[PDB]
């Protein structure tokens, strides 16, 4: 049937942009994979 999905807190966009900047500065110095990423996204 229909479930009811709710997230307790918000997504932290500032923290995400910080992680991305850190990722960039650190990088400075088939169906199995589809199913895996689908399990990660909608699991």
């Amino acid at each position: 049937p229909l479930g009811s999905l709710k997230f307790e807190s918000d997504f932290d966009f500032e923290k995400a942009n910080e992680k991305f900047q850190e990722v960039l500065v650190d990088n400075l110095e088939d169906w199995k994979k589809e199913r895996e990423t689908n399990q990660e996204t909608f699991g």
Binding site: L2, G3, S4, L5, K6, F7, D10, F11, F13, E14, A16, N17, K19, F20, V23, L24, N27, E34, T37, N38, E40, T41, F42, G43
Partner: protein, 167 residues
């Protein structure tokens, strides 16, 4: 052809596990009239439609594994506004031309700038103001800057409070 004139573009760094959470946060915080959310496969389109409906939001979805008449009628109903969100794959040869769609969300960021343009671009010099929000993963970090360069635009990090006069 297509341009990105009125479209303000942002990106949010996410993992695949965080994508549904990020989308729900966008739905809650943003002032969306109508929205079109792009995915990279039909399977993911249907799964994301399910997730969106679970979160409490109505949903439309179209993809390639569909009868073209069903697809056309669903698109007509979405343009008339019976539902406020439409999840789809890449099947828009021309640019989207709906004044009510003030937010487009790339749930799955594409690899080619042509696809990004066909999702985000506009026809003519007087397109309505819109938002383009890209969900960027680690495997998307280089394609992000590459597509940003090829199209001569800028894709800024998403701010915690977006100017309401942009969309």
């Amino acid at each position: 052809e297509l341009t990105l004139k009125g479209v303000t573009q942002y990106y949010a760094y996410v993992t695949e596990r965080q994508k549904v959470h990020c989308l729900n946060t966008l739905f809650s915080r943003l002032q969306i009239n109508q929205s079109i959310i792009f995915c990279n496969s039909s399977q993911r389109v249907e799964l994301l439609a399910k997730k969106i409906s679970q979160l409490g939001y109505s949903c439309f979805y179209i993809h390639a594994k569909m009868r073209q008449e069903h697809r056309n009628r669903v698109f007509h109903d979405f343009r008339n506004g019976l539902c406020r969100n439409l999840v789809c794959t890449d099947l828009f040869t021309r640019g989207i031309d709906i004044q009510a769609v003030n937010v487009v969300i790339n749930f799955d960021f594409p690899k080619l700038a042509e696809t990004y343009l066909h999702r985000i671009g506009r026809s003519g010099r007087f397109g309505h103001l819109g938002l383009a929000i890209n969900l960027i993963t680690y495997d998307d970090r280089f394609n992000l800057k590459s597509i940003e360069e090829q199209l001569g635009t800028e894709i800024k990090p998403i701010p915690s409070n977006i100017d309401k006069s942009l969309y």
